[PDB]
């Protein structure tokens, strides 16, 4: 299904999809795209309307440009904003540890105002990131993500509340802009207003128009009917334009005589000055959009006209005196309505080129300020554009931007899934952003407007519910910054293909079909009555007249990941939540054997996650390698492929990559040509399928315990790839250098013969832990020593040096091969920072076989940790007598609602089995329908359902029905889907039939070395003299309260003054009582803990007679 | 009458409510360290005793030559702000902050707060001879016995 | 009669803060 190299797999797709899923990385690629502004993105954002495009860095040139002194006599111009070519391709930035960047040229000119002059010079305005065609960025060689920050929409918000004294209804409007103050419009609980522009305790409506210049006449004529305000031109209590603008300004600061600049100037400074009061492009839509403004308009700009004001006055005052709608003169009619808080329409997407756009923009903030301030203190006539601008603190801001921010995180790449869905990323918090835990839990939950467009499944599982949310599939960006989503729209029952991109907003007053309908044909209905919702959300059902629109496909309120779980209509979604989040967190296997059963996903997500060998040109194949692949075009030149064999991740995952195909293949524009990671023949993997049994069986499957079959282990099936890197430097001292060497301080020669001749191990050598790494050395001084040690060291006849020994070793449970050798120097012309003579990296990798305890889990949600490692006989087998995999409990069934395991266990036996359907004279009414041309399989087949629309239940008792055995007539597996098996352990059949089956599963990262810590003696702090514990210590056990409340309850109180003494601060005593345990003598009593007497003395220290007795 | 009360029971003076001698705290609780590299770091305390210590040679080498009052109310009352500025920032008008514009430890700061009584003592720490790892099921065992 | 509620009060409050941070 246009996809050239796909292998076959059948579906049970009842209805067809006219629209194709679009491209995933559309979000990210083509939001850079823009501020570059591309000859692509001209087209592309030229084609579909949009008349006059502009460039993202030209947004702000044209605010920016032109520059202007205070004096007026002199001018500053800035002009086309264009890029250079690349410097370094990315194999070498991510090998050579640099940015992935590119230069800048900006063509400025300095004007004369007095006589007009023409310096014009094209400046390098820096160095400037790029983005793969990966969607990614290199810095420093780390790959790092941006993740997209949602916040809420400027612009007119209008509420109502009801007081809770008199229970009267009060209507207020925030109207915020983009940086700058606000203004409230608000209704007492009496009469009658509350007009306090940036929260200066009240105002009232008509000293603002008269004050705005305008007659107490006009308040009668336009706004009298609407006659609350009428009370407010009684009450005004003052006559007068500038006479009340004089209380005014005394509103304002208060305190000072005003003058005629703070009359009307003033706050035409602060409402119709456009250099600090300046409301969002789309917040300007969005004010057209909602108060039914000239909307009619290419309009650009961001100034406030008080005609906007008096019309959310009108509005307002119509809307508290009780109506439903509202027209305008020169202007279109508007439904009176309030207002909505966590709507999509009132809650847009700051995209990256937004935040870099912000980043640019606050980079030339800081920039400019002393551009101007240098407007004037550098002499006139001498000055070239070159001797004004600073280039340095822009590319201080970029470089300041990519470190330090929450928004900028590591690529998570351990899972090409995951790194899919660490893009298409919803996130609430951040700089911009609300706080985390000064946020109430009622942004978090889902109200009926996120339908389609964010799937509400997918979060994490911990302290962050509601706040990440997940990009659905068919979702695509508004370049005003919105979700918008395509629907079929439907004429008098008959639907088009009229594919229409919509957003929510407009989706309110139309009329949204269903997805699984009874459709004729044509797009005609069976049926006359359909559900539907209304703009409320609720559901109603509704006869077939009023449908405009239709849904396009299921599956849309589901996102990506979410999209690969099937069955997920027949079990919980808190479980899926759980299962689904775990998908991210597969390891890779060595195999990659394809899944048995999946859906319409993991094909069509591998080749747009971009770590697979896509066919660029359409040609035939030349010449392959193990390493290479020469192509041949088929016009004229041929091009080489070098895969990528064993990188690192982030993580210590595998990034081999490896061919499928031979040398000599016609191949066409986009097919596979080699895959990488757990990718098999075009789509994903994350384990294996296997046999599994439901039956509990000797407290092995315990609460969710889990065992395993002998065979896997010995045939290495589960087998893993991890490599850990270590890093040390050759640096200067005060004293002197440190030293990389062959020679060393005493020591064994059996610890030296796998070095080189130069310090550092050579290549494949086996390590255990305690081994030594890099020789370094460094000088100690001149000390003095024991006349003992000095004694003994005349007795062996050996002074050492004066240097110490402090080389670079392994850590501990640690062991395998090490591969590459990574070396620099400063004196080798190597960038590295300041101090450093020379460093080294290493590179070790391990093959770790599976063992107990480790985390597994099925796709239903359904996980738990390894118990037993079996051998191969005690074990149940069937009547032919092939052993069992894994069993699996009983009771995980019913509390925790996951039956899709036990649909894919029936339909997995029955694609391992294969069928060929018998109805020779007539098709049973169970596969009657579905599709037609399936009623076979040959065994170990490829098939798949999709989410919503795959397999019925008798269909799925259908399939069973048929049963091609495996070498003689033999129905091990009945009607009922269930077996009669042996005792592995003493011999005899069990007295009743066992569901059993096929079942895919997976493995994640969760490994026993990771989390496994232990201590006798090691580090402390320097502060206190407690234990301390990171990566490279041991670790440490923090011991809690609620613990020491329990030893109470107890009241084995020598445990506790055991614990918080000996154990953790007393130095003088630990000597002792490791002392005394080396002797095997008595246990000390504990002495005073010191840490105590601390606080004594700080008592002692502000003026505390304090005394025991 | 409570407090004129309290002065009344117990055998003391309103004498330390005045002072004439400020004590120091012992150095290793205000510890200085050099980092790799010639990397130092101490604690923030040091140079508000040395805003002290030069306040009070200051004035103190000032009165010997004698002075218009105006000067000696201001460097008294200096010395008095930076008495109050080592016990406690921020309690009189505006704090004392230093690079980032970010406020210092004082004295109640070591005391008061997220680092208070329970958040040294009874916040609970760490100890060795110790361990965690993950665990699985030992059905064979006994209820004395684990693995 | 567009007076509000305790703003003479903020300007006790903000005033005896104010002379406060003026006096200090």
């Known amino acids: ?1109 | 009458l409570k407090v004129v009360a309290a002065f009344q029971q117990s055998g003391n003076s309103p004498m330390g409510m005045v002072l004439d001698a400020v004590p120091v705290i012992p150095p290793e609780l205000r510890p200085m360290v050099q980092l790799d590299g010639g990397r130092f770091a101490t604690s923030d305390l040091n140079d508000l005793y040395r805003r002290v210590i030069n306040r009070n040679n200051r004035l103190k080498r000032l009165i010997d030559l004698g002075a218009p009052e105006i000067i000696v109310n201001n460097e008294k009352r200096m010395l008095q702000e930076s008495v109050d500025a080592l016990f406690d920032n921020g309690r009189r008008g505006r704090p004392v902050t230093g690079p980032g514009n970010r406020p210092l430890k004082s004295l109640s700061d070591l005391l008061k707060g997220k680092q208070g009584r329970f958040r040294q003592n009874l916040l609970g720490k760490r100890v060795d001879y110790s361990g965690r790892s993950v665990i699985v099921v030992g059905p064979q065992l006994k209820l004395h016995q684990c693995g | 009669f567009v007076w509000d509620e305790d703003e003479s009060e903020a300007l006790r409050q903000a005033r005896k803060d104010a002379e406060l941070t003026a006096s200090a």
């Open chain 1, 1 to 1109: 299904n246009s996809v050239p190299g796909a292998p076959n797999r059948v579906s049970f797709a009842k209805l067809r999809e006219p629209l194709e899923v679009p491209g995933l990385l559309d979000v990210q690629t083509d939001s850079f795209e823009w501020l570059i502004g591309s000859p692509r993105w001209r087209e592309s954002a030229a084609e579909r309307g949009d008349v006059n495009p502009v460039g993202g860095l030209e947004e702000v040139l044209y605010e920016l440009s032109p520059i202007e002194d205070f004096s007026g006599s002199m001018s500053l111009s800035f002009s086309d904003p264009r890029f250079d070519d690349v410097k370094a391709p990315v194999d070498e930035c991510k090998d050579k540890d640099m940015t992935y960047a590119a230069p800048l040229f900006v063509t400025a000119e300095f004007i004369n105002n007095n006589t007009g002059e023409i310096k014009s010079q094209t400046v390098f305005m820096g160095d400037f990131p790029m983005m793969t065609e990966k969607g990614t960025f290199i810095i420093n060689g780390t790959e790092r993500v941006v993740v997209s920050q949602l916040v809420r929409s400027p612009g007119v918000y209008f509420d109502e509340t009801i007081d809770k004294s008199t229970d009267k209804t009060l209507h207020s409007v925030k109207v915020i802009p983009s940086r700058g103050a606000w203004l409230e419009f608000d209704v007492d609980k009496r009469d009658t207003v509350g007009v306090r522009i940036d929260r200066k305790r009240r105002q009232p409506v008509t000293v603002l128009l008269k004050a705005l210049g305008w007659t107490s006449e006009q308040i009668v004529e336009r706004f009298g009917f609407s006659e609350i305000m009428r009370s407010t031109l009684e009450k005004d209590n003052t006559v007068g334009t500038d006479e009340a603008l004089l209380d005014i300004y005394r509103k304002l600061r208060p305190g000072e005589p005003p003058t005629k600049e703070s009359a009307q100037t003033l706050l035409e400074n602060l409402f119709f000055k456009e250099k600090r009061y300046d409301l969002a492009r789309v917040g300007r839509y969005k004010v057209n959009k909602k108060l039914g403004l000239h909307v009619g308009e290419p309009i650009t700009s961001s100034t406030l006209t008080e005609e906007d004001v008096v019309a959310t006055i009108e509005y307002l005052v119509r809307l508290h005196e009780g109506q439903t709608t509202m027209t305008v003169p020169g202007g279109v009619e508007v439904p009176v309505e309030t207002d909505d808080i966590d709507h999509f329409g009132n809650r847009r997407l700051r995209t990256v080129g937004e935040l870099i756009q912000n980043q640019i923009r606050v980079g030339m903030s800081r920039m400019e300020r002393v551009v101007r301030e240098r407007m004037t203190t550098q002499d006139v006539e001498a000055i070239t554009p070159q001797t004004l601008i600073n280039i340095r603190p822009v590319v201080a801001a970029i470089k300041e931007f990519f470190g330090t921010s929450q928004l900028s995180q590591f690529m998570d790449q351990n899972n090409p899934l995951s790194g899919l869905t660490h893009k298409r990323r919803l996130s609430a918090l951040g700089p911009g952003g609300l706080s985390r835990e000064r946020a109430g839990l009622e942004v978090r939950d889902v109200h009926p407007s996120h339908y389609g467009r964010m799937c509400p499944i997918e979060t994490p599982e911990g302290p962050n519910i509601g706040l990440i949310g997940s990009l659905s599939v068919y979702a695509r960006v508004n370049p005003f910054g919105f979700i918008e989503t395509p629907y079929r729209k439907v004429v008098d029952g008959v639907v088009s293909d009229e594919i229409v991109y919509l957003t929510a907003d407009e989706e309110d007053r139309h009329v949204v079909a269903q997805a699984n309908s009874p459709i004729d044909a044509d797009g005609r209905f069976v049926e006359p009555r359909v559900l539907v919702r209304r703009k409320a959300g609720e559901v109603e059902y509704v006869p077939s007249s009023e449908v405009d629109y239709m849904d396009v496909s299921p599956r849309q309120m589901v996102s990506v990941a979410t999209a690969m779980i099937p069955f997920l209509e027949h079990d919980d979604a808190n479980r899926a939540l759980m299962g689904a989040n775990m998908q991210r967190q597969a390891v890779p296997l060595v195999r990659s054997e394809a899944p048995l059963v999946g859906t319409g996903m993991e094909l069509r997500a591998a080749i747009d996650a971009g770590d697979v060998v896509v066919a660029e040109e359409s040609g035939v194949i030349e010449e392959v390698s193990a390493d290479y692949i020469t192509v041949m075009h088929d016009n004229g030149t041929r091009r080489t492929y070098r895969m990528r064999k064993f990188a690192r991740s982030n993580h210590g995952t595998c990034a081999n990559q490896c061919p499928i195909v031979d040398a000599g293949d016609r191949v066409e524009a986009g097919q596979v040509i080699a895959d990488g990671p757990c990718t098999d023949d075009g789509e994903m993997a994350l384990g294996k399928n296997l046999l599994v049994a439901i039956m509990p069986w000797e407290g092995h499957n315990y609460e969710d315990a889990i065992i395993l079959s002998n065979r896997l282990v010995e045939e290495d099936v589960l087998t893993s790839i991890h490599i850990e890197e270590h890093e040390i430097d050759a640096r200067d001292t005060k004293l002197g250098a440190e030293e990389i060497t062959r020679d060393i301080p005493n020591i064994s020669d059996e610890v030296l013969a796998d070095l080189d001749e130069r310090g550092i191990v050579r290549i494949g050598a086996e390590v255990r832990d305690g081994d030594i790494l890099v020789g370094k050395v460094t000088p100690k001084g001149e000390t003095e020593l024991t006349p003992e040690e000095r004694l003994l060291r005349a007795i062996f006849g050996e002074k050492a040096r004066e240097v110490r020994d402090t080389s670079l070793k392994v850590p501990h449970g640690e062991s395998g091969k090490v591969i590459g050798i990574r070396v620099f120097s400063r004196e080798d012309e190597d960038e590295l920072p300041a101090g450093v003579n020379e460093l080294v990296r290493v590179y070790v990798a391990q093959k770790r076989k599976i063992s107990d305890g480790d985390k597994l889990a099925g796709r239903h949600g359904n996980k738990g940790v390894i118990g037993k490692i079996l051998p191969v006989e005690d074990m149940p087998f069937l009547a032919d007598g092939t052993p069992v995999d894994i069993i699996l409990n009983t009771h995980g069934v019913p509390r925790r609602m996951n039956i899709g395991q036990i649909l894919e266990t029936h339909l997995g036996w029955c694609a391992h089995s294969g069928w060929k359907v018998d109805a020779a004279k007539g098709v049973p009414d169970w596969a009657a329908r579905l599709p037609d041309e399936l009623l076979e399989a040959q065994p170990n087949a490829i098939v798949s359902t999709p989410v919503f629309d795959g397999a019925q239940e008798a269909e799925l008792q259908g399939l069973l029905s048929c049963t091609l055995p495996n070498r003689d007539g033999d129905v091990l597996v009945d009607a009922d889907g269930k077996a009669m098996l042996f005792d592995g352990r003493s011999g005899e059949p069990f007295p009743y039939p066992v569901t059993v089956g096929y079942m895919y599963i997976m493995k994640l990262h969760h490994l026993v070395d990771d989390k496994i810590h232990a201590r006798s003696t090691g580090p402390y702090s320097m502060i206190t003299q407690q234990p301390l514990g990171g990566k490279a210590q041991f670790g440490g056990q923090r011991f809690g309260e609620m613990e020491c409340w329990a030893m109470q309850a107890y009241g084995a109180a020598y445990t506790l003054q055991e614990l918080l003494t000996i154990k953790s601060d007393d130095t003088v005593g630990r000597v002792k009582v490791y002392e005394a345990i080396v002797k095997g003598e008595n246990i000390p009593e504990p002495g005073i803990p010191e840490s105590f007497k601390v606080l004594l003395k700080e008592l002692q220290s502000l003026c505390l007679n304090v005394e025991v007795l």
